[PDB]
């Protein structure tokens, strides 16, 4: 069913499936330590995960996969998806990360923040479009665990869907009036960012793991299980 969508139907499906922006429990009148502040991020990420799981079901082609493969894709991609959502909604807040509408933070854990800030700056100087963003996010879901799985039929369906979304990105860029050279260049610029997002995710998963070991920042049962998937 996914393979027969047109470009504009793909974008609509993806736009319609967008999850909500949740609030944090941040209270400016309450003092926070680095501990409890990090607890605000992990508490928020846990609640976003529930919405991400139900958003993933609405990504064209996702539920055509075995439950085992859906599990694997989300385990591999969850933090990348949280991060790209973060940098998207931080775009118009230069120098800050809008984790929630009530939680807008500056660099003032530090290294990851600077990377997220650099990525959102990159999105801003590219004038990343909302239609392009939902395409990238779906690409990460389908792409990030595909080479870590006949589970060979499954991989092939994923490749066809990913090609479909490439077609969709190009269609968007042609509609925006880009020359063909510009379409290819922007397509490459957008996909190279996914390498930086994968990098940020790996780094954060390592800091998440040590946070678990220190046992000072609370981590939900779902977050620990996602974390264990990365060993």
């Amino acid at each position: 069913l996914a393979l027969s969508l047109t470009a504009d139907q793909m974008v609509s499906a993806l736009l319609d499936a967008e999850p909500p922006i949740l609030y944090s429990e941040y209270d400016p009148t309450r003092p926070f330590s680095e501990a409890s502040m990090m607890g605000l991020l992990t508490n928020l990420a846990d609640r976003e995960l529930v919405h991400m799981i139900n958003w993933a079901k609405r990504v064209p082609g996702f539920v055509d996969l075995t439950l085992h493969d859906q599990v694997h894709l989300l385990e591999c991609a969850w933090l990348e998806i949280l991060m790209i959502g973060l940098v998207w909604r931080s775009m118009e807040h230069p120098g800050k990360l809008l984790f929630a509408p009530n939680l807008l933070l500056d660099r003032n854990m530090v290294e990851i923040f600077d990377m997220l800030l650099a990525t959102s700056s990159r999105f801003r100087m590219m004038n990343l479009q909302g239609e392009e963003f939902v395409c990238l996010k779906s690409i990460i879901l389908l792409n990030s665990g595909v080479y870590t799985f006949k589970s060979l039929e499954e991989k092939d369906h994923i490749h066809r869907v990913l090609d479909k979304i490439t077609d969709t990105l190009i269609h968007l860029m042609a509609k925006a009036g880009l020359t063909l050279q510009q379409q290819h260049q922007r397509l490459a610029q957008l996909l190279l960012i996914l390498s930086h997002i994968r990098h940020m995710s790996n780094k954060g998963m390592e800091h998440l793991y040590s946070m678990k070991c220190k046992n000072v920042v609370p981590l939900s049962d779902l977050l620990l299980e996602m974390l264990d998937a990365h060993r």
């Binding site: 799981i53 439950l67 859906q70 779902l222 299980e225």
Partner: peptide, 9 residues
């Protein structure tokens, strides 16, 4: 596995 069953319903 929490993720497995959240995906199921």
């Amino acid at each position: 596995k929490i993720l497995h069953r959240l995906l199921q319903e």
